[PDB]
Amino acid sequence: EPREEAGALGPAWDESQLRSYSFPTRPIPRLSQSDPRAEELIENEEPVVLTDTNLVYPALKWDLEYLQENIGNGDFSVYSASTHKFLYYDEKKMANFQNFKPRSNREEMKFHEFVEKLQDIQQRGGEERLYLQQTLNDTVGRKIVMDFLGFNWNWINKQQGKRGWGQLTSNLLLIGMEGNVTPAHYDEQQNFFAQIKGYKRCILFPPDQFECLYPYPVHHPCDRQSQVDFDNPDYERFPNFQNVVGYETVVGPGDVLYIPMYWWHHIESLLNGGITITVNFWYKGAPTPKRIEYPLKAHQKVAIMRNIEKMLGEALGNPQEVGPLLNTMIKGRYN
Amino acid sequence: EPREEAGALGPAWDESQLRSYSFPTRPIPRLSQSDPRAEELIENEEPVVLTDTNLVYPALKWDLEYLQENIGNGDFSVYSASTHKFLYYDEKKMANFQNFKPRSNREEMKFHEFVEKLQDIQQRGGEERLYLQQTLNDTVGRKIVMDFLGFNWNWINKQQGKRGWGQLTSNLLLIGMEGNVTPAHYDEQQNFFAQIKGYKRCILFPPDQFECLYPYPVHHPCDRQSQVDFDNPDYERFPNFQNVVGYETVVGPGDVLYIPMYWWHHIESLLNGGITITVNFWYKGAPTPKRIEYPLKAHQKVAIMRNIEKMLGEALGNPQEVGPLLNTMIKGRYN
Ligand SMILES: O=c1c(-n2ccnn2)c[nH]n1-c1cc(N2CCOCC2)ncn1
Ligand SMILES: O=c1c(-n2ccnn2)c[nH]n1-c1cc(N2CCOCC2)ncn1
Ligand SMILES: [Zn+2]
Ligand SMILES: [Zn+2]
């Protein structure tokens, strides 16, 4: 049920702005940061939407004109795709798969060019979509540095400490166009997802739904991404996608979503919602305890599978041979 | 083509004494130890039958009465089975598989008891078969120690040196009944197989026929043994057994067969051939070279698969989980 914006300004969004998919979902909880239930979820590495952290309060006034006037005359990475689905890939892994065709090229440019290229597609017909994805606190205008310093570092530093996490590895500014989709993938780091402008529908799946989501081979450029086309699922290749169940929410300005380490997430900017602005805070997870407590968590089994694949590629001297060897290993032996 | 025994004593054996199987074979070469081709085969880790090593010359006079009179009043391990197929298993691995039923029990006894139990089955109807399998040069009669010392240690020590092998790990005396079958398995050590009394048909398969022979899971008691019943191959479970091709020979008194590290071998004592006597010499292979030369040998890929299985069992804390994890890893990802 969409929430009502204050001052009787009407529904923040409506269901017609959400894409439709084949699987059921249930809501991620929206809680106050002072609510003990919210700490219990984070500590147990389950997602939660915090409504009142003020994590990026000073950034809530951010729009394009404000960022143009103040973000500086440096260069920002702009990713491009002809469709709504943005196909992220690892350039370092392209050699292993020469039959891989990048479906979303990347271009560096000054902020004002992104604003005009964005505005241009608007005044035109715009099948093409864009995504600005640049690390924060680097070569940025003094005014933004002020806003940046005004994030609620007290709260998030305390979280980092309580959860025993490692260092803040990255701050990332995302500016996207309506309908932009980042397909399902998982990350190895903890993520506080701070929404600033517009609305993003986030669909999360726990690590134990690995079997249902069919990630690419570790050595493939799309490592950690699901092979399933959520818009046209191939049930013969990916039969267990019919068993997937997600946790769903729509976050808006002022919301913070905790995406736990190894949780799949599918993120879409609402159709006809205008531009979205987001800042992610990525932290290295806490280190593995001395005594491994059994039974293993699902995400630890995922780590094991990754390591096995990495090891076989190193040992065989060729990532292409991993698949053949694994099949040799199980066929008529373990299946 | 069976060889003719000297002095016009007739054919050593005939085809009717060989069991019949579903796969083609071709002959292992019979060469003189002085033949350079024989050294080339051993060095390249391919099987060869050496006809004139005199490796166990003093043991060629061995029969049951001679061994009884001279082998000593100690205890020898006697394996038993109701059928011709002797199901060897690792007692240490039985816990992992409680649904495993040993089909061949083992009993210790004095040599004269084995001779009488053997003789008894003879005078009776004898579906039950026996196999004496005891390590040599331990608690043995002085006369046998003499014969033992008279093996051609010069020749085999030189082989050990040329091939850079490790130590002689074990000497094994085998006494078996006609029709005894040791089903297909592979060993991790080099083996000179010295035939003394009677005839054994040896069928070998190279390591690259792993795919066709379907070994048990590493953690199973029958580790390294083929799951295929050569007498009734299940082609639905083991489809690539239809592609297996073996190297075949019949070794008799005075012959030595080199079974290279990791080669599958199926060994049967000829039907209606009387008892067989054999001594195996097992050596640890040479150590892996500093710089791993690609492409890998087939037996190195086998080693990799073993290590992966061993590792997963340790990491998951449970061998039973290896199969499920491997399938999760490949299903819709690598197959
Ligand atoms: O970009 C995102 C993201 N998100 C948040 C709002 N909309 N999308 C969630 N995770 N995530 C990423 C993003 C990413 N890269 C970093 C390098 O350049 C391209 C994006 N790698 C892993 N995860
Ligand atoms: O027993 C044999 C054998 N063979 C030779 C003639 N007839 N059979 C060839 N290999 N082999 C074995 C035998 C073996 N064990 C040792 C421990 O007790 C049972 C047999 N382990 C591995 N390989
Ligand atoms: Zn991500
Ligand atoms: Zn063996």
Numbering used by the authors:
A (entry chain A), B (entry chain A): 15 to 349
Which passages does the manuscript contain on this structure?
The transcriptional activity of the HIFs is regulated in an oxygen dependent manner by 2-oxoglutarate (2OG) and ferrous iron dependent oxygenases which catalyze the post-translational hydroxylation of HIF-α subunits. Two proline-residues, Pro402 and Pro564 in human HIF-1α, in the N- and C-terminal regions of the oxygen-dependent degradation domains, termed NODD and CODD, respectively, of HIF-α isoforms are efficiently hydroxylated by the HIF prolyl hydroxylases (PHDs or EGLNs) under normoxic conditions. In a second 2OG oxygenase-mediated mechanism of HIF regulation, factor inhibiting HIF (FIH) regulates HIF transcriptional activity via 2OG dependent hydroxylation of an asparagine-residue in the C-terminal transcriptional activation domain (CTAD) of HIF-α isoforms; such reaction reduces binding of HIF to transcriptional co-activator proteins (CBP/p300), which are histone lysine acetyltransferases. Here we report studies that inform on the activities, mechanisms of action, and selectivities of the PHD inhibitors (and related compounds) in clinical trials for anaemia treatment, i.e. Vadadustat from Akebia Therapeutics currently in phase III, FG-4592 from FibroGen in phase III, GSK1278863 from GlaxoSmithKline in phase III, and Molidustat from Bayer in phase II.
Surprisingly, analysis of Molidustat complexed with FIH (for which it is a poor inhibitor) reveals that the nitrogen of its pyrimidine ring is positioned to ligate to the metal trans to the distal histidine, as do R8J and 2OG in binding to PHD2 and not trans to the proximal histidine, as observed for FIH-2OG binding. Thus, the binding mode of Molidustat to FIH might in this respect reflect that of Molidustat to PHD2.
